[PDB]
Design a protein around this ligand. Structure first.
Ligand SMILES: CCCCCCCCCCCCCCCCCC(=O)OC[C@H](COP(=O)([O-])OCC(O)COP(=O)([O-])OC[C@@H](COC(=O)CCCCCCCCCCCCCCCCC)OC(=O)CCCCCCCCCCCCCCCCC)OC(=O)CCCCCCCCCCCCCCCCC
Ligand SMILES: CCCCCCCCCCCCCCCCCC(=O)OC[C@H](COP(=O)([O-])OCC(O)COP(=O)([O-])OC[C@@H](COC(=O)CCCCCCCCCCCCCCCCC)OC(=O)CCCCCCCCCCCCCCCCC)OC(=O)CCCCCCCCCCCCCCCCC
Ligand SMILES: CCCCCCCCCCCCCCCCCC(=O)OC[C@H](COP(=O)([O-])OCC(O)COP(=O)([O-])OC[C@@H](COC(=O)CCCCCCCCCCCCCCCCC)OC(=O)CCCCCCCCCCCCCCCCC)OC(=O)CCCCCCCCCCCCCCCCC
Ligand SMILES: CCCCCCCCCCCCCCCCCC(=O)OC[C@H](COP(=O)([O-])OCC(O)COP(=O)([O-])OC[C@@H](COC(=O)CCCCCCCCCCCCCCCCC)OC(=O)CCCCCCCCCCCCCCCCC)OC(=O)CCCCCCCCCCCCCCCCC
Ligand SMILES: CCCCCCCCCCCCCCCCCC(=O)OC[C@H](COP(=O)([O-])OCC(O)COP(=O)([O-])OC[C@@H](COC(=O)CCCCCCCCCCCCCCCCC)OC(=O)CCCCCCCCCCCCCCCCC)OC(=O)CCCCCCCCCCCCCCCCC
Ligand SMILES: CCCCCCCCCCCCCCCCCC(=O)OC[C@H](COP(=O)([O-])OCC(O)COP(=O)([O-])OC[C@@H](COC(=O)CCCCCCCCCCCCCCCCC)OC(=O)CCCCCCCCCCCCCCCCC)OC(=O)CCCCCCCCCCCCCCCCC
Ligand SMILES: CCCCCCCCCCCCO[C@@H]1O[C@H](CO)[C@@H](O[C@H]2O[C@H](CO)[C@@H](O)[C@H](O)[C@H]2O)[C@H](O)[C@H]1O
Lengths: 227, 52, 231, 78, 105, 85, 168, 96, 103, 78, 78, 78
């Protein structure tokens, strides 16, 4: 979404209330994350807690492994509720963007003010707390969805083109899953037909071998700041 | 459409530049001094008596 | 000292604007090997091995606009300087080398230590590693030197031969009306043949040198590429 | 006593020496084509491919001769 | 060329098997392993840690080909002359009777 | 000689000269003007980027104690090998 | 206070008029260089310590575990001691931007603070000097401008064989 | 007045500081001579003495930049290390 | 759909190209530019006379001397420099007057 | 008597002599490609692998010429 | 002392050296034809394609000999 | 000082060097006839076409020899 004067006025008016709400959310999310981290450290598997190293087979560069470095706490409901988890995720996004902005401010002193004016003129990188009414929240969500639309096709095309140019599926079912995986949203994709693509790509590329450009595209599509 | 207009203007500018360069612009530092500049200094201090 | 000058491509820039305001397909490329690095299927690389395509195409375009058109008399190769070519090759080669080094994978350099465990490490293998590390920089220097020297020598020879041809054509054409016309005709035919041969040779050599210039960079890149197999 | 002498004509001698480098290059090029003929008669189906490799070798070998020729011009024109 | 796989802990030969410049630096000579460069090279080759030999070399070349080469060429100190112009340590001092300005306060 | 003269740029238009001292001083003035305002604390990465490397280089120059003589960078004549002055 | 903005002009002038550099000023600059090296060393030590503290448990086990390159016995003892010391207590082992911040921000802050205060110290030292450089520094801090050709204006000391120019 | 000899032959066996000072003195002498001529003619000095002033300026810049090295432990160590007895004998033998 | 080359304007695409596509090359180029302007941006008058002119230095008018004369005149006039100061001349003003009367 | 003489055009001779070393480099390159052309016709299926080794020899053969070329400049420009 | 000397007859020496560059060129040409006969004798049906390549090799080798010959005549007239 | 010297025995030295190139030609002749015999033995039916091609090779190689020989005689009488 392009910046505008109306959004600039909206964000300037709600700047300090937004900061206060962000601080309150920060306290709440710190509590939630403290609970979750204590539970992970206490009941987590040895590999997950010790941060086992998984290196690539070509350049031996460490990256997170989906099987070992990711763990699902099946018994987290006892300590943390679903709503708390959703709140933590939203706060993580908002805190990421706020941290990048604060880093820019600290780095450039008082010279970031015009860049701050550019920032407040667009809802793409402002926290959700800056919206105090339903219409403002709707506009903010629209901006986020616009950014997702802008970013996702590049990631999908990167993945599909690389795989198709450097590899082909083994069997017919894998072919069907691969072809139907990248259909447009106007048609409904059957998850059962599409699932084998997961194993096929695990054969091709895992999350531990994800390239940096593809990662940048994915982070763009997840509204995660990249600079 | 955009590129056609931009390239039309670029072509006119490059045509003018080519004409000026290859038919009007004199070469610097001529032996006779009849054409072109011999160079000069810039960024000279001004209003700084303490500098000397 | 600040000198203001211009390249000799303004007319060619005008032609590019005129003839490429609309799209056109490209099917013939001087260095096609930058697009097809992998020839065995199911092999793939996690490194950005296709990053050099754009630079390769732009360099080919620039050097072709300069060198090929330089055969036209009085056309100037504005970039024809030894240290400028050194700067260009330094940029490209060192940028790719630092891309490989910033990866912080020291095992990538294991192949520098040439030979097997049977060979003495200190007196054979270490010396070979030293020589290879030196040979990388020597390859860069050789690339830029070759590119410079080929053009310089070709154009020197062309200028000298053209001067000789002008001299004989102007100051000895009257021999056509004289009794020694046959000698002049033979000399003139030989000069025409040499003219054609030199032009063909230069045309071919320019393209070939550009091919080699890009191939050296691609070889640098390939020397550190590792291919995984799909399963 | 300190005497400094500058002989002009020496540049001719150095120029002629560099030309000797062409003897190896000219011979080297002929070697490539000799193998090319003796290879095309052993596998004519690849004549076009071999001709391509022969030309590449000719340029690399020729490139060296230019290096020497450049030095000849430098000294001959200085 | 091909992919590199680090050796397993059981595939690494013992340190005592490594040889130095003259011979193995076994018991009563272990502390000499630190000083013997050839022994360290052979140990690294045995442990497949060849990069320790190659990485310092290449980087060094780069460091000379990039930054130190020109630094030496443009700012390096050449050989000193026979007759040396040493400093008499007489320059710089203020003259007698000069009234220096007061320091900030 | 004449054939060698054919390898020169053919579209030289203007040449400008400037002393190193003058434009270095002007650059220092600009840097001070832009780094002076209070809203750029000295501990900011921008200020350190601006100042620290220059300070280090100048200190290295001052500390230099070379037994040889380095001729002035901007002499009138630097083509005579037997006259460093 | 921003001492670098004031000191850059003085350093450039000294380089231009380095002839009048007394041995005291040379010692001052050598001490500044030594303190810069010391600050670099301490900042690097802090960075290494922070990196080691935040390192993952498996990473520490791999780094400070078998095999031993030398296998002298002291190497293994030291590695085991360090590994036990690190793995005994609980350590915050962040990854990504968090580790970057933790390892860098303290190091940058320490290095910058030390360098800034050493620059202030050098400014004070040059203020206390009784040479032409000290007078130039004092005049710069007083009038705010660098007075070039000062040594010849106030007739700073010269070698006995070069005093003819002052003969007026 | 008398100009110093700053020819290559004379400069060869001279310390850098002495040569720089001699160049500066020659520049000053030439500048004052030109100024005296201008004053005798009555014409403005700026319109006649500009080039001499510039020469004096450049010689001043060259002269003030050079600081002879201090004789200390490391400098003496370097000088003795390079100038060994063998090297001194070789230099004496060489006629160049 | 969105593409950097087709949707973004030229400056934005330039920044993106040289920051997220060829950043190392740009860094090396800037380094080399700085080196060239720090060590290869000077030309002495003798060098200019030898090689700095297309057909040769026209000694019959010495444009370098005129250029330096204009430079020094401008500097003196703008900065209000007293070229008669003893430091420039090496002698007092009275000695200068005596010399003028002598010659 | 002690007489010191400086002949100022001798660096041309040394430069030409160093340039002569390029004849061997050119000849060696021609030999490599001559063997390549006569070897591909024998085992065409491995043509590509041979070409890689042929270039390697050129890379290790052209480098030697650079040293000789390097000396030429160090004496031609001094 | 500064002494400038101009030796006239040196141009004869330099010219003779460049003539030596034709030794390899003449040898190289002879090598091509010698290989051509073997290829024709071992593959008699290709008596024209081989002949064309032999001519091409001769032309390139002749070109190298002519580059040197230009210096040989140029110095002789300098 | 400007000194002009004219040595009248250096037109001999250049002549001798130009004669050296003949060796590269004479050896080239033997190579063509060295391989002609082998080709005749391999394929006696082509004793004629091979002989004609060998004559072509010898003539072209001799052409290089006479180009060098021209320089040899010019400097002998001048
Ligand atoms: C004054 C000096 C200044 C120096 C110069 C600085 C120049 C600017 C550089 C940037 C500095 C930081 C800027 C502020 C960031 C905000 C704080 C923060 O870390 O946010 C968390 C967040 C962590 O990100 P993450 O990816 O989630 O972390 C993954 C970890 O696994 C996360 O671990 P986890 O999964 O276990 O989750 C933990 C999480 C769980 O907690 C929660 O979930 C609760 C929320 C906690 C975080 C809240 C952040 C709020 C941010 C917004 C603040 C308000 C802004 C208001 C703006 C408007 C004001 C008017 O809690 C954390 O986030 C803890 C992270 C670790 C702490 C990092 C801080 C270390 C430095 C501070 C101490 C310094 C001591 C000095 C001692 C000196 C001794 C001599 O920070 C970021 O978003 C990362 C920064 C993004 C910008 C990067 C820019 C480049 C940086 C390069 C630095 C290189 C070194 C320095 C030299 C530079 C030279 C060029
Ligand atoms: C009070 C507030 C609260 C407190 C403060 C809070 C904190 C605030 C700060 C933090 C805020 C963060 C978020 C910011 C978001 C907005 C960012 C932004 O700018 O968005 C684009 C923003 C528009 O954004 P938008 O419309 O919302 O669209 C956003 C889309 O989502 C499009 O999105 P996109 O992603 O496609 O766009 C991204 C685009 C962003 O970029 C752009 O879009 C380009 C913006 C500039 C375009 C300029 C075009 C016009 C040029 C005009 C030229 C002059 C004309 C003639 C003038 C004549 C005047 C008389 O590309 C990039 O991100 C590239 C990044 C490049 C990074 C560069 C890093 C360099 C590193 C160097 C290498 C180091 C290596 C290591 C070395 C180590 C050595 C030891 O651009 C503008 O608004 C354009 C402004 C143009 C101003 C006028 C022209 C310049 C005037 C200069 C005046 C100079 C005066 C002094 C002169 C002195 C002379 C001596
Ligand atoms: C036709 C001609 C037209 C005109 C052409 C003009 C001439 C251009 C010629 C040359 C162009 C190419 C130059 C390339 C250089 C080499 C680049 C390179 O090696 O990059 C590697 C690498 C590539 O970056 P990347 O992160 O991989 O991705 C870059 C993509 O563009 C990221 O893209 P993305 O899509 O992934 O993310 C999009 C989005 C994602 O959204 C976000 O990330 C959220 C928002 C983030 C806000 C920023 C957070 C920053 C956090 C702290 C960063 C570390 C600070 C370090 C300490 C400070 C050092 C100063 O991010 C943004 O929207 C970024 C907005 C940035 C706006 C500013 C862009 C520059 C405009 C000019 C302003 C400055 C003018 C100064 C000169 C004039 C003065 C009078 O760079 C970095 O790692 C970034 C380091 C950044 C360090 C800070 C900047 C250092 C440079 C000096 C700053 C001086 C400031 C002066 C202030 C005023 C003083 C008076
Ligand atoms: C003191 C005397 C004056 C001089 C002062 C200089 C001050 C210097 C300060 C110190 C600088 C130190 C460092 C210097 C390093 C130099 C290195 C160098 O030269 O490298 C060679 C290198 C050569 O590159 P190249 O490969 O030849 O390509 C560059 C070309 O520009 C072509 O590249 P391109 O085609 O890729 O470029 C993009 C091109 C894309 O193509 C085009 O846009 C086509 C047009 C091309 C124009 C540019 C070519 C110029 C051709 C020659 C001149 C044309 C005729 C001028 C007539 C003058 C008559 C006196 O677009 C443009 O050029 C954009 C500008 C378009 C302007 C259009 C204006 C329209 C006005 C319409 C008005 C209508 C009014 C109606 C009123 C009605 C009332 C009723 O130069 C450069 O790369 C650029 C160097 C520039 C360095 C910065 C210099 C500072 C800025 C000075 C501006 C002075 C303005 C005031 C002048 C006033 C008249 C006297
Ligand atoms: C990750 C990247 C991968 C990709 C790489 C891509 C590139 C290719 C690679 C090759 C590089 C290519 C070059 C590209 C251009 C880059 C720029 C450049 O070349 O600039 C050079 C440029 C050269 O300087 P320059 O401008 O030519 O001026 C020369 C002057 O010397 C300047 O004067 P200054 O005042 O600046 O002082 C400089 C000073 C720099 O040094 C210092 O300032 C002091 C030391 C700093 C240490 C830093 C921290 C190290 C760690 C501390 C401890 C940690 C552990 C703590 C816990 C311990 C527990 C027990 O050095 C010296 O002057 C020499 C002093 C040496 C004293 C030796 C005294 C004797 C006793 C010690 C040695 C012998 C020990 C024998 C033991 C025997 C036992 C049996 O800059 C410098 O080198 C100096 C400034 C920067 C200093 C950075 C210091 C940190 C370096 C990194 C250390 C960590 C990484 C390495 C190890 C990694 C292991 C995995
Ligand atoms: C204006 C400001 C200017 C700033 C200038 C300073 C530089 C820029 C500042 C920072 C800029 C922001 C971005 C930085 C890069 C971020 C990289 C990143 O994303 O890391 C993520 C990563 C987090 O991911 P993770 O999953 O948690 O862990 C990584 C995985 O392990 C990854 O797993 P893996 O599988 O990849 O494992 C491999 C990994 C393993 O490494 C790691 O990741 C561990 C952390 C690094 C350890 C480094 C120390 C190693 C030991 C050194 C021992 C030295 C002993 C010397 C003794 C000398 C005695 C005399 O990488 C390596 O193996 C690399 C090792 C390093 C090799 C260094 C080679 C240097 C060659 C030098 C050549 C010659 C130079 C010239 C000549 C000099 C001498 C004359 O971050 C880190 O691990 C640490 C980040 C630290 C960031 C830098 C902090 C900067 C602090 C600056 C303070 C000083 C300021 C001075 C200012 C001056 C005035 C302006
Ligand atoms: C967080 C750390 C804070 C540290 C605060 C201060 C700690 C106490 C003082 C530390 C010691 C200081 O003592 C320091 O000694 C060294 C010599 O070894 C001196 O250095 C002196 O001799 C060395 C000898 O090589 C010279 O290189 C140097 O140029 C010269 O100045 C320093 O001028 C002095 O300051």
């Amino acid at each position: 979404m392009q910046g505008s004067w109306s959004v600039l006025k909206k964000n300037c008016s709600n700047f300090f209330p937004g900061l206060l709400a962000f601080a309150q959310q920060t306290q709440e999310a710190y509590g939630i994350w403290l609970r979750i981290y204590n539970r992970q450290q206490k009941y987590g598997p040895t590999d997950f807690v010790e941060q086992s190293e998984t290196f690539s087979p070509d350049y031996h560069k460490r990256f997170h492994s989906q099987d070992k470095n990711m763990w699902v706490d099946k018994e987290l409901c006892t300590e943390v509720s679903q709503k708390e988890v959703a709140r933590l995720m939203t706060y993580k996004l908002d805190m990421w963007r706020m941290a990048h902005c604060a880093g820019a401010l600290l780095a450039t002193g008082g010279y970031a003010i015009p860049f701050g004016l550019f920032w407040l003129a667009n809802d793409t990188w402002v926290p959700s707390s800056f919206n105090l009414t339903g219409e403002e929240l709707r506009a903010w969500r629209e901006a986020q969805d616009l950014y997702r639309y802008r970013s996702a096709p590049s990631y999908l095309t990167d993945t599909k083109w690389h795989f198709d140019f450097h590899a082909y599926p083994w069997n017919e079912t894998q072919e069907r899953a691969w072809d139907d995986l990248f259909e447009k949203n106007d048609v409904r994709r059957d998850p059962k037909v599409v699932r084998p693509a997961a194993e096929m790509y695990d054969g091709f590329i895992k999350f531990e071998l994800i390239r940096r450009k593809s990662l940048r595209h994915l982070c763009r599509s997840m509204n995660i700041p990249t600079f | 459409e955009i590129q056609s207009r931009k390239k039309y203007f670029q072509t006119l500018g490059y045509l003018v530049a080519f004409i000026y360069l290859y038919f009007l612009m004199p070469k610097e530092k001529s032996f006779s001094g009849l054409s072109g500049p011999d160079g000069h200094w810039i960024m000279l201090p001004k209003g700084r008596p303490e500098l000397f | 000292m600040f000198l203001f000058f211009f390249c000799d491509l303004f007319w060619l820039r005008l032609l590019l604007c005129m003839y490429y305001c609309v799209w056109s397909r490209l099917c013939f490329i001087v260095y096609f090997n930058c697009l097809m690095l992998i020839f065995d299927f199911l092999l793939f690389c996690l490194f950005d091995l296709y990053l050099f395509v754009g630079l390769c195409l732009f360099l080919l375009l620039w050097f072709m606009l300069f060198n090929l058109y330089s055969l036209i008399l009085y056309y100037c190769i504005t970039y024809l300087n030894l240290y400028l070519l050194f700067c260009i090759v330094f940029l490209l080669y060192i940028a790719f080398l630092f891309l490989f080094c910033f990866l912080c994978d020291f095992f990538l350099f294991n192949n520098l230590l040439v030979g097997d465990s049977f060979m003495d490490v200190f007196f054979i293998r270490f010396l070979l590693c030293f020589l290879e590390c030196f040979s990388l920089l020597c390859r860069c220097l050789s690339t830029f030197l070759r590119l410079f020297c080929n053009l310089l020598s070709s154009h020197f020879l062309l200028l000298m031969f053209f001067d000789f041809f002008y001299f004989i054509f102007v100051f000895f054409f009257y021999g056509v009306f004289c009794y020694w016309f046959i000698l002049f005709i033979f000399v003139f035919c030989f000069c025409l043949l040499f003219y054609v041969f030199l032009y063909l040779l230069d045309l071919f050599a320019a393209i070939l040198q550009l091919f080699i210039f890009c191939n050296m960079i691609l070889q640098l890149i390939m020397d550190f590429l590792l291919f995984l197999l799909f399963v | 006593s300190t005497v400094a002498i500058s002989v002009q004509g020496l540049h001719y001698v150095g120029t002629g020496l560099a030309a000797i480098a062409l003897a190896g290059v000219g011979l080297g090029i002929g070697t490539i084509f000799g193998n090319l003929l003796v290879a095309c008669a052993r596998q004519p189906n690849l004549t076009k491919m071999l001709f391509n490799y022969a030309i590449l070798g000719f340029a690399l070998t020729e490139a060296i001769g230019l290096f020497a020729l450049m030095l000849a011009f430098l000294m001959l024109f200085s | 060329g091909e992919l590199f796989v680090r050796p397993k802990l059981e595939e690494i030969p013992p340190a005592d098997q490594c040889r130095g410049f003259f011979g193995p630096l076994n018991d009563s000579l272990k502390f000499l392993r630190l000083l013997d460069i050839k022994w360290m090279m052979n140990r690294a080759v045995a442990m497949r840690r060849e990069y320790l030999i190659a990485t310092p070399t290449l980087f060094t070349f780069i460091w000379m080909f990039t930054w130190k080469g020109a630094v030496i060429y443009f700012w390096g100190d050449r050989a000193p002359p026979r007759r040396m112009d040493w400093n008499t340590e007489e320059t710089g001092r203020l003259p007698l009777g000069f009234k220096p300005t007061p320091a900030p306060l | 000689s004449n054939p060698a003269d054919h390898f020169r740029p053919n579209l030289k238009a203007l040449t400008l000269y400037a002393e190193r001292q003058h434009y270095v001083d002007r650059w220092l003035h600009v840097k001070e003007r832009w780094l002076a305002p209070w809203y750029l604390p000295w501990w900011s990465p921008l200020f350190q980027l601006g100042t620290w490397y220059s300070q280090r280089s100048r200190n290295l120059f001052l500390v230099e104690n070379h037994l040889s003589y380095r001729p002035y960078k901007f002499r009138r004549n630097d083509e005579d090998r037997n006259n460093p002055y | 206070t921003k001492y670098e903005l004031k000191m850059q002009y003085f350093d450039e002038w000294m380089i231009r008029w380095r002839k009048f550099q007394t041995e005291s000023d040379w010692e001052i600059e050598k001490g500044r260089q030594w303190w810069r090296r010391f600050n670099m060393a301490v900042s690097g030590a802090l960075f290494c310590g922070l990196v080691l503290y935040t390192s993952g448990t498996a990473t520490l086990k791999r780094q400070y575990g078998l095999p031993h390159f030398f296998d002298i016995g002291v190497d293994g003892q030291a590695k085991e001691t360090m590994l036990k010391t690190l793995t005994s207590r609980w350590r915050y082992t962040p990854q990504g931007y968090g580790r970057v911040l933790i390892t860098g921000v303290p190091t940058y802050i320490l290095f910058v603070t030390l360098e800034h205060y050493r620059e202030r110290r050098r400014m004070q030292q040059y203020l206390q000097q009784n040479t032409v450089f000290g007078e130039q520094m004092r005049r710069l801090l007083s009038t705010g401008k660098i007075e070039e050709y000062l040594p010849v204006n106030i007739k700073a000391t010269l070698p006995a064989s070069q005093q003819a120019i002052y003969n007026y | 007045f008398h100009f110093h000899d700053v020819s290559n032959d004379a400069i060869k066996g001279m310390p850098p500081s002495e040569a720089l000072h001699k160049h500066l003195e020659n520049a000053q002498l030439a500048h004052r001579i030109c100024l005296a001529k201008a004053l005798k003619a009555g014409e403005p000095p700026v319109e006649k003495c500009a080039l001499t002033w510039g020469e004096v300026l450049i010689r001043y810049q060259a002269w003030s930049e050079y600081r002879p090295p201090f004789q200390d432990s490391v400098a003496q160590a370097k000088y003795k290390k390079y100038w060994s007895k063998k090297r001194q004998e070789e230099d004496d033998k060489n006629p160049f | 759909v969105y593409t950097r080359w087709k949707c973004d304007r030229l400056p934005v695409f330039q920044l993106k190209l040289f920051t997220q596509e060829y950043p190392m090359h740009a860094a090396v180029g800037i380094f080399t530019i700085i080196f060239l302007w720090k060590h290869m941006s000077h030309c002495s008058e003798e060098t200019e006379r030898k090689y700095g002119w297309w057909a040769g230095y026209p000694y019959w008018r010495d444009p370098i001397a005129r250029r330096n004369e204009t430079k020094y005149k401008q500097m003196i006039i703008n900065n209000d420099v007293d070229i008669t100061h003893p430091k420039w001349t090496g002698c007092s003003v009275e000695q200068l007057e005596e010399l003028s009367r002598v010659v």
